[PDB]
Design a protein around this ligand. Structure first.
Ligand SMILES: [Zn+2]
Ligand SMILES: [Zn+2]
Ligand SMILES: [Zn+2]
Ligand SMILES: [Zn+2]
Ligand SMILES: [Zn+2]
Ligand SMILES: [Zn+2]
Lengths: 326, 326, 180, 326
């Protein structure tokens, strides 16, 4: 009858023995290239035209569309818990603001520039980052100024984006993150900051590698998912043009790209961006009990760190600010 | 009143212009390091003790636990559609088979060895891969032979695993995939195949980098998620010990690791493993409409390819065998 | 040896035993600091034979230099010995070390940087030596510098140089300061 | 009872044997990438407005603030003992010289330019290096020309620094060492020397990596201690902009940085700068008997050499000029 067979083997080779390196819970921390701190997280903020706003957005999120009047009660618990940075997204709702040139982009009385002025007065501890694009301010909804019924007009889009970027910095934003993906915008935004004498105090956080996908919502310059060479050339371009830091978006599905950015842009801080759709997919899976949210969030976020990122833009900051306390 | 500002800029630099490289749908295929073919997919198969079985497993899957008697109706549509490989997982259910030495592992009349004998007679076109471990055959459920109430006994586990591996090859399995993660098993399995004169015809598909996570089920040698250095040393060990191919599991959350394996193990075929929990998380998200399954499956699977893999073990093969037809 | 040098064979054979005995008594990790050629291999082999290899982290003092940092005033690299330090780092990893130590640290930051590239996949550890610790304290009391200030600078230096672990006599303090 | 245990071991491997390489005192010299010569040391000199000066400064030093009238008796013993280079630091004391534009910086009758004229007449053997900055000549004490109650005005500071640098060279200084840390100063100083036809005879010794710390005194552009990527990009910038040599300051606490500069700037002479605070900390420790000064000075200074430097700016030159004799 069937009996357990045991082949004979040679003595163990030391080169085969890796196990003494990870056997204790502590050795598991010892084994990581970098550990998750609270000053690494960056919380996205969606500021509304309506100063009293605080409207729930939806997918699987727990994120809102707040207004300058509710902004102080929302950032207080966060700041006290250790939050050190936020990235600003303006959401102009008033019936007659959006246009073909994204005019409302640097509107001194828009959500963003008013979000900046409020934060720097009530939370001078917070590092202000601002997303730079025209998608949310143009009537068409594209990332830049279009040509008559066609493609994006590179020259006008960039020239426009440089202005918005310099205006946020002039209003007090410590950092501008351009997310248009339009060729050469980093150079013009950097040159514009230089001419505006704000280059030495505004960190240009480039979304160097922003891919298109089904991670933004079920269903303009944007790398195709298989585009690794373009992503690498875009990383290198953006650093040569002046970027002081780089962003990879999405992150979990593009970990190899963050690893590439970690070698191409070795001397610059890399940032991973946990996209709404990834966040909303972790939440869903969680509720369907396919996985445990806290468990899948630490795994996913340690992945950014392991892949090479030292900064993470995520909608899970509120939570993490809790969990890292533990 | 607020008017759109447009900074003045210098002429465009050619080095900033990448866009001519991705503007047409075709250029998006042109831009990929490698494209998804049907002979790249590997379908996992769970073979039951009960020869008539065909029991639905559950998370979000559409995968079953079939028996030798239903195996022909299940692989027919698949094989005709282009499926070229399968990886065998035996599931011994009979009330008195599991034990401390995983005796039933190479049981000539077990699910696996009978799954091999059936396939090689009804589908001699199919490439047979077999997972090699003792977790599913030991009373304790661990990946190897334990010590009296303690850790895993390296020597006995490996000596046991080498035997199971040589027995599957002797039964006709073209490839053995060891997934124990036990130090030096690749060497003993390779030596054992050599002594059994089966080394020149059995491809050792090593699960070189198998991390522990919440991707196997909501909630033994296994790399910790942040363990990049261990993963790299394990990749290099396994190739020096004889692996002919490598597997990274999970895949989507470990794309940077597949990218590392693509450089450490450059001359060997890399394989990504879309884990049950990732599969079950794509399905969930899909049904909650956070994303479109087909869309999120192509994105995720092209990610393996972009990250460096040329083979993919996924539960989405049935589907892909359809989609690639289109 | 009788009135002479160190007897490699007996020293190593002896050191392997001590190392396996600490592990058998419950020590999670053994750090060999003799600097004697091949001890890592025998200590690793001995742990293997004692079935304790998979649970004992061998933290090798791969690069231990001789200096005036141990006390005012046997295998030990000479301060200018960079090539030996690099070959010793590589030897110790091939022989089984799971982690590496560089001692001293502040005066050997370039060596920790070298270990960070030679031993890239292994945890590097810096060792703030008694004499460095005692020199930071002295300087402090003479007001040449501010202890907390010079301790963060020096210890961030280990981190910047490549270390992810630090053996220091300033832990009590740091356990306070990082709270802040 | 407890008896000495001796495990049995295998024969020694040759790859384990390094000891035959360092067993004799001579082999310890043989083992160094480079040895300390006297023409490697650079002695800092602090020249006072008061021509008869010779005021002891204090920390732990033995360095003074001399004046042109005492300069000949001070450099004589040094020069005869082998000193070949000095770096000039002007110290304007007269009650109404310092201002917002560092006007006195290139004052033809200031300490520096008069220190240059004196040395080139009494010691034409000496290589004259001059520190280039405005900190010691501006009323504010900052490294450059400020903006109205704010940050440093890049454009005016650099434009000013280029002039000072060209004026020292025009007065006879063989080398200018800019220590402001202001972005792009090397390029303007190099361009200015070119336009002044002095580029082919003035060595630009850039303080490429100057970090801020508690090593200058118990307690403007300056890299933060953990800033390795910035230090590396600054090293590369400065060489592309024209630096002929590089300086890393401080040195002992930044040995890894000198090692990085040794690879980034491989074809250029690297220089370590033993800072006042390090010098003053070696002296203190010495007097408290924590260590032996001569012993700790050779160790520390051989460290610069091992780390990659071929030049050392230190306050221990007088001593070394003695010790190397032995
Ligand atoms: Zn946009
Ligand atoms: Zn669009
Ligand atoms: Zn298993
Ligand atoms: Zn287990
Ligand atoms: Zn200065
Ligand atoms: Zn200052």
């Amino acid at each position: 009858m069937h009996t357990a067979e045991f082949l004979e083997t040679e003595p163990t080779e030391i080169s085969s023995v890796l196990a003494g390196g990870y056997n204790h819970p502590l050795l598991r921390q010892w084994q990581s290239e970098r550990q998750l701190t609270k000053n690494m997280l960056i919380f996205p903020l969606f500021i509304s035209d309506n100063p009293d706003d605080f409207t729930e957005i939806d997918s699987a999120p727990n994120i809102n569309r707040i207004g300058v009047n509710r902004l102080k009660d929302y950032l207080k618990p966060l700041v006290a818990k250790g939050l050190r940075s936020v990235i600003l997204f303006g959401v102009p709702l008033i019936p007659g603001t959006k246009d073909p040139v994204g005019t409302a982009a640097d509107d001194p009385a828009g959500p963003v520039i008013q979000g900046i002025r409020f934060i720097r007065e009530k939370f001078p501890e917070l590092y202000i980052i601002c997303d730079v694009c025209l998608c949310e301010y143009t009537s068409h909804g594209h990332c830049g100024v279009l040509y008559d019924d066609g493609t994006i007009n590179r020259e006008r889009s960039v020239s426009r984006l440089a202005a918005v970027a310099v205006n946020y910095a002039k209003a007090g934003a410590h950092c501008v993150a351009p997310s248009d993906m339009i060729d050469g915008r980093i150079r013009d935004i950097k040159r514009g900051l230089i001419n505006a004498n704000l280059a030495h105090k505004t960190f240009v956080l480039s979304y160097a590698a922003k891919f298109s996908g089904n991670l933004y919502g079920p269903a303009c310059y944007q790398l195709p998912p298989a585009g690794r060479g373009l992503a690498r050339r875009a990383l290198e371009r953006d650093m040569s043009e002046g970027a002081d830091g780089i962003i990879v978006k999405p992150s979990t599905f593009y970990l190899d790209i963050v690893r590439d950015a970690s070698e191409i842009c070795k001397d610059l801080p890399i940032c991973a961006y946990h996209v709404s759709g990834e966040y909303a997919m972790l939440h869903a899976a969680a509720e369907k009990g396919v996985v445990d949210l806290k468990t899948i969030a630490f795994e996913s976020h340690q992945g950014f760190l392991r892949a090479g990122a030292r900064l993470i833009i995520t909608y899970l900051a509120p939570e993490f600010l809790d969990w890292l306390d533990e």
